[model samples]
Target chain A: SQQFNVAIFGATGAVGETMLEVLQEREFPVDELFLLASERSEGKTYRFNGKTVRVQNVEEFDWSQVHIALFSAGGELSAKWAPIAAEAGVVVIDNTSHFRYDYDIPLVVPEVNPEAIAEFRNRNIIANPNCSTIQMLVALKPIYDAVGIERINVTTYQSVSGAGKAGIDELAGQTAKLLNGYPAETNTFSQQIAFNCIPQIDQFMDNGYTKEEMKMVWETQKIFNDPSIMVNPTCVRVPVFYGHAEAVHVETRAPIDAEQVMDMLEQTDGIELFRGADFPTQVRDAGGKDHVLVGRVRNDISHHSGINLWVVADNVRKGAATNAVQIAELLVRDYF
Target chain B: SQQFNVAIFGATGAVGETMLEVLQEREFPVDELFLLASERSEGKTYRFNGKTVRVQNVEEFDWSQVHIALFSAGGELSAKWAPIAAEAGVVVIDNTSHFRYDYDIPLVVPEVNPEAIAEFRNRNIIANPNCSTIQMLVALKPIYDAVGIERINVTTYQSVSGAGKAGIDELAGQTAKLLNGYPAETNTFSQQIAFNCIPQIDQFMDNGYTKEEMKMVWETQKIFNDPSIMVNPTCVRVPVFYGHAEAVHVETRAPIDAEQVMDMLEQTDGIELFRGADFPTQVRDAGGKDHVLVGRVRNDISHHSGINLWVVADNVRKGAATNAVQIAELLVRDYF
Candidate 1:
């Protein structure tokens, strides 16, 4: 009498909360649902499909009963518990950066590389790439498949929400403090992010690229399954509360025009491609949307076979929660 | 005792008002000062060098009495009045895009190309490069000279103040309104800019690039004096009040490392260079400063002969007002 049983780890966190909402909104078939969190969130309750689901502490719970477990607490928490949940016969879909670079594990965005999900057999864990990587790859996959991408240069305008609950609170609190004629406090971020931008995101590496930037370079290669394609990314955190926008310039192996790329994107599934000057922005267009919003498509002026586009998406939604749920849909429909 | 008589055209506006402050701060030599505005702004006063100068009506003022005039009013005002002022023997240093592309005019960023100023003699008029171009070219000039730049890719995080006083008011007003539970109005910008990013800057041109985006392309060619140097730019507007920041990736004709670029930037005038992840930002480093702030200089991973940098400068200061003052200093020091 049951379709499937699903469990959400880190149910009280930003992405976890959105996962509940997205699941209900998409009308995902569920026989029984479990909300799992740390011991501190044990007594909390979140509504899924108009039913109050009490959060259960993961330490005292059994993962074997759950068919699928979505993990996004933090890299440390995911590293600690993901393998355990996987071994307990639960298909784990992890949203943290942990285990994504494992040679045997499958790193996926359902829209871009659902076929690669078969590699999940190696570890019983399917890794979700970083939010920044998810959006860029979703928008680029159609073009990449049509005319092979040779190189890509991207600069991200990532939101505070991508950092988590503390990021949202810091931006809102610091902004009000500044407006009220007081200095802002920097706790969640290395620099004041109320009205400023910090060029560094995550830990800086010896090569001068931050971890967040290198993640894009690594994930793209794995997902595209092409080691020769070059990617250069500069990731900066902006003051946005939700959506993440990216400016991408790509050089293709063969010549492609703006109109041709637009034609392919128009027919592609899960993409909202815009033409002329009607490109999507963060707050006004991408917030609360499931589609990967893309616009400002044009032929690169400097390179004969290059193209540039602007991409925006709700990082918590398509970039994280909704994307995870879509992969779950694929898991139950095909793999499981 | 007279060095030269100076006039501030559009003196009541944002860049125009700052022109007065920058002159006082830098202490540009002047025998007399004139503040000129439209008929509506007449009788208003701005102080220069401890003296109250009433805003003179530009319609009735004798342009011949002033040796140099800095105009920052919109393009129409500059178009209609700049030629007339030049005909009356006042050298016009225009801050609008009206005469920038004219064969007879020289678009000048003094740090990048001071010799171009001499071409102002053809029309007794000179053009100032766009603010986005001014900050980037300042940081790129030394490297360009040493390594010979073949191409450039830049994405700008321009502040609200680049749109002038109305842009500033819109951001402040919308941010406060949203915090108070009201829908923010979009008047000065095409979309909501409070805690959001807009990929467009100015009106769209036929080439699918905004007029603001094309300015960088046109201005870079004019300032570099080399039509072959390829520049691909994406101009974006952010919700900061004063400074403009740019992420620039360059392909050089010669191999250049971070250390070599750092050495050259340290010796260059009007540049304050900071290295590594700890570098300049909009609020703390560039709000009221006149120098171009350069930071995050590093080697690009995808290319052997590529370099990347972050550049910030007060668009109102070095980008507009301070640049105009430098042109005047060169004028008096060399010509007057």
Candidate 2:
């Protein structure tokens, strides 16, 4: 059996744990799986394929031990060790923004542009798009292909999980205390996230757009390989624990009917197109699902050649883990 | 001293009760105040201007007894009782959608279109726009006036309070149960609203837009008296108790700089604009405020002539009760 060895670079974090779950659930061929984290989380344990696996320190591990490495510890960790691991002939699938803008590295959403994965040999690393960009591209790529998208206006209702485990606990803790008539402590977020929506995510750029917002702009262009695509994004964090939903309005190069776009979406791979009056929600439709859920597709009344969409997906799954796994699946089958 | 006799219709409801408080706070010259509700809520009492007033049955009351009436009971009550009160020579400021679209009835956001109050004589009724529409227009009016707006794209994170007292209690009650590990009941909302966002605000229309979303589109055109202006809206219900927040992106007819837009907003009345990295959140800045809270004002990088904004306000105050009171203040000053 020519099954490859795998290493999860941030095995103790929210996304790293989810990466392990997704890899196991998808039954990615595995001769062995290495769970690597910082020394602070060295002894942490997780269950994989019904067996207990303990996390090992990443800095002490041999990079050559694994054929594929999933890096999502943080931008700092990825920047520090990704090149070293890549130099040792390990194919790196990075889940951080550190290397996404490097002109040489390809930012990928497997469904939107799997062909870009071939460029991974340029650096031995394939960059995953931001969670917000991944879902938006997946929902719009079919339409972008059908009738070229000239401009996009998106406002995201991203969840606490997008900020990781501390963000999750903060929301739960704050909601519990507030329900009992106590003040919620705000630490992980800029404001109280228990019953509020905060408009700023990541640090604000000099241009007034947050770094999180700019990622949507930058990553979309790279993944589509279209420099002329215009994206206007406002990223806000909601109290949700899982799914990320966006109200996306796009202006196409030509007039496209809403019915025709829906038909294309229904036929496209990796999409769950909802029709009629029914639509997707974070809790009911996209909590732990893999499909990029899209609904409320209709022609925009404000513009002559525009369409509006409601796109939802489990941010940690399809937005991050499952997407990386999908790319790895494509990698082993086609390239390796 | 010519003091006016004022009546608050549906005085037992949320907006109705707030109307009574708003009148007292503004110290409007009142010779007498009538608190009216249905027979079922006949004896409900509210304190206005240091006196306890009992709610009388609306059906039994003489409409001519009051010079002005504030209606927020519901569309059904307004449709039946409003015209009757109007014909009896009582001016009405309605907080329902029943009369908003009537060609003769002027829809007014006091700060944006107080002049529209004079036309109340056409039908003896003035219509208050939807809460979502009220906040958005107040935020955009100055900009629209400055450079002229060709189009608007908005996504709202509205509070539960927009649905009235029942909506407020549903969010609080559901959060309590879910915190205790019990299944939260869903009644006031279409889904669990404790830690989620529901995209559907009102019933779905034949055009695939919700009634609430259409209100923003319809009300903006009517209030601005510019049918050429186009609007696209997605109204959502969030877990918050008091305020509504919107991410608004607009395409202008002329090129206006972001700094110039901020200067205009700061000079405009009833707007609290935040510049630099400072922005408004519902919990921190808008929970109990009167001003339309605006922040994150910047030029859109995607489009050359587009600007983006984050707008928030107390839906109950500026969106309804206070707006009606302001209209009344203008009415008594000029017309009566």
Candidate 3:
């Protein structure tokens, strides 16, 4: 068995912590594990493989010591440190928007675009798609390959955790206050998110779409290698803490039989299909699951070639940590 | 002013209670107000017209005593008692799904289809459309009237109050239990709705759409009197308690401009429009208001002839109680 050294940047944050857990649970062959964070979290420790791994300051650590690095400390940190780590002869799988749109750097969802990982040699960095985009593409990949998708209309019910730990705390705190006869105080989001739904996610773009909404539009086309596919997205933040659910309607280039889609998706990898109105909710089905759970599959009565689906996933796992780990697995198998 | 006798059936439930409040706020020309409920709430008292009115048993009440009766009890009760009240010469405005699909019974939203209320003379029953349908049609009526609509793709983030008081209680109870680190108990909905989103709203039909989703389809056509118009809906239940928000994408038969739609909606009656990415959430904007809010208006980036909007309103007030009362106001102004 081959073993390699791996480093996780932003080890103390939500996605970073989940990366550690996933790497251990997936049993990646690791001879040495390095946990790196900012100077403030340098002394913190995490349990992996039945031993304590102490977090070290990224500024003081040598990136050349690791075979691969997973970076998820927002776009600013990734923009600042990813290039330096790549120049140090380490493969960087960054889970941020900094490098996704780069012409030479490939945006990879291992299930959707594994061959793109070979392009990591261009910049020594591989980009992971956004959480919402990752889950949507995974659920749609099989169907898109079968009948060919022409257009997609999607509305997302995103959990607060997509904004990281601060978002989760805001929802929890505001909810508790409102329940106890006190007014809810809003700080993290633009509006009160407790027991509410906000239509804006991330900053608004020049096109009247939020930046988060435009990411789905751009990433779906880039990963599919088809600039012709049209996607309309409405990104909303709900009060849930973990999973994201999307109501997706698509028009096929060719006629589609929804029953065939259900059967095809049932047989596809990294996907779970619910037959009819038997659908999956966020809490009951996707809270801890790795596979994207899809249900409510039906032919659109409005258009002959249209179909609708309900897609749910654990945004932190299958959407982020597990996906980046899968890419690393692919990298070690084929390139290293 | 010609004062009339008005009776409110199911005056103890959520929508029933809201109807009472709306009647007082709107100051309907009431000669005598009668509050009727089931035997369980026979002696319950409510205030109306600056006096106390005791709820009497509906089974023992004489329908001829009131000129108009608003029913919000379940479908079974409406099925049994609505015709009896109509036979006694009292015009019935029902808020349940029972009489909505019946022939000769006009389904009404005053803003969209006030003329349809006149058909109530045939069956003496005017049906108030579903909570989801009312707000959607109110927002789209102006657009549909401008450049004819060909197809619609919509997804709803609905509140628990749509299920009545029990639904609200279940969400509150489940949320409290989960926050205290206990397993959430699901009762009102088929699954846990605390910190969750349920794709199912009502019972499933053979075609894989819930009855709640299909209601939007059927009611939209009847209210618009345009059977050729296409509608595809995915109705979801969120954890919010009061308002319902919808992400709507529509393809117009003719070319449309989003700015033109915004200007038209801004000038239209009973609507509030938020320009561009400035949108409205459920709790902050629609909890106690009577207007249907339209926001996030934009030209669809996916299609040449498409436009998108975020529509929201208090489901119980504008969607149910206020709409039914508006029909009554129209009925008295002309029909009586």
Candidate 4:
């Protein structure tokens, strides 16, 4: 395997920290590593490979030495610096929504579509799908291939971690205030999120659905190559700190047997089938894991062609950082 | 006011116990009170009106001495015993679904439509709407009377108390196990209830909706007496203890201003309007004195005629027990 030197942008953010942790946990071959952040996070040292790597200011950092650069900064930062890095001959794997819908960018989930990386090598940028969509596609890919999904109705129970450190702080601060018999103040969300659920995840789009809701619609189409599949999604933010869980109902072209679905999940790469009475805990799934925990599989009584499932995964890890690193691993094995 | 002797069926259940508390809290005119339960709970003593009332076996209890009966037992028990109590001249106010859709029995929420109580004198039976339906209608009745509701899309974050003691216990037990690192056990619900949301609330009907979801649809139409009004409800069970919160999106026949809606709610009889970004808490609403807490009112950006709101209330108190007790109070005020 060829070794690669990687650089991480926005090293102080939630997804940025997870990106570092996942790369280390997976022991992805990194001959060298560079960490860059905003001027505020400059000079901070992050430990990698049992040694401290000093963070540099992104404005002053040189991207010529970097082989693969992971961008988890906000869209503005990515818009400003990603092309600059890409122009310097570094392949940029972006974990932001900046390039997700771009025709030139290949949105890659390595386990689902490893072949997409071939398309990514030609272009300088690879886009990571939304945290909710990544986990859903990981669980549904095998089934979609086997039974050919006709429609999906998904209601997400997403954690605050998907929104970054500010999201976690908002929930924690609100919960502390609530425990002390004070009202929870809203800042990160339009409504209170402590001990409550908010239906709107991202901002409302022109179509009335949120950006988070529409991700399932658009990303699923691109991932499965099926724009004809009907998709309805409700994205909700809960008080949980980690792991995004989804209640997914699907209608296939033909009747799907539970055993067959389980068999497909068992054979599918990067997905774990936790079928039977009990499996999958948010606490267990958190702390930087990459497996898509699929369980609570049953038939939807409302439709003869439909089935119901409960899918959960650490949104920051498998949904964001780990998937990005996994794609990096596949790229190293095949293209690097 | 002429006082009447009252008897409570299923005195040991969740709603039954709340009914006892509500009766005492509201200072209902109870000349004498009887507590009746199944054989297992017959010997239990329940605190009421500064005294402990011993629960008598329902099979051996005399119904003729009671002038009013409140039934919070399961549907089968209420179906079998409610009419027998009513036949003996005891007006039975049932909180079960056994007779809610029956044309002869009037389903009442005192603040919304008090005139429906007159039917109780005709049939000797009154029904309580579903918990989710009651709170939504209480908040909607004022708006419906003001601008007239054309269509409603409600998504409920209902607490376990609506499912009774088992539901509450299941959440508590599962939460404890989840926090302590034990695998979540499924007993009360078909799936794990801790740190998760179940989209299926009640049994699935032929119309591709749960019975709990359909209750909101049918009861809204019946209570508002507007059969043409459309309601799309997705009933979900959250991990909260008592309050039932809803994300309501509505299209009014006429364009209604947000301030006018708040003003209407303020003047409405039973609702307590919390405005200016005041978020309602389930902990406060658990044993809360208020029936409905409405806040977070705003306009839906997509539709000129539509508005969105967050409505919350104690499902046990306002949704079931207190609503039933309020009806009894109205009956007393109207009769003798």
Error of 4 at B235 (Å): 7.0
Better model by lDDT: candidate 2 vs candidate 4: 2
Off by over 4 Å in 4: A121-123, A180-187, A255-259, A279-281, A284-288, B1-5, B10-14, B17-62, B73-87, B96-156, B160-237, B246-313, B322-336
Scored by Cα lDDT, where does model 3 land? Answer: 0.92
Error of 1 at B98 (Å): 0.7
Among all candidates shown, the one with the greatest lDDT: 3
Candidate ordering by lDDT (highest first): 3, 2, 1, 4
Winner by DockQ: 3
Lowest lDDT sum, 10 consecutive residues, model 2 chain A, at A275-284
* Per-residue lDDT of candidate 1, residues A1-336 (tens digit): 238889899999888999989889988888789999899899898888888999999898898888898888888989989999988988899989888998898998998889988877788899988888999999999889988999889999989997887999999999999999998989999888988887878988998889999999999999999998889898988888999999999999999889999999889888998888787989999999888999999989988888989999999999999999999999887876
Clash-forming residue pairs, model 2: none
Instruction: Give the alpha carbon lDDT tens digit for every residue of A4-68 in model 4.
Output: 88999989888888899888888888888999998888888989989899999998988999899
How well does each candidate reproduce the native contacts, as fnat? 0.64, 0.75, 0.92, 0.07
| Reference-based TM-score, model 4 | 0.74
In the range B140-189, model 1's lDDT, one tens digit per residue, is 99999999999898899999998888999999999999999999999999
Per-residue error for A169 in candidate 1, Å, reads 0.9
TM-score, chain B, predicted structure 3: 0.99
CAPRI class of candidate 2:
high
- DockQ per candidate, 2 decimals: 0.78, 0.82, 0.86, 0.16
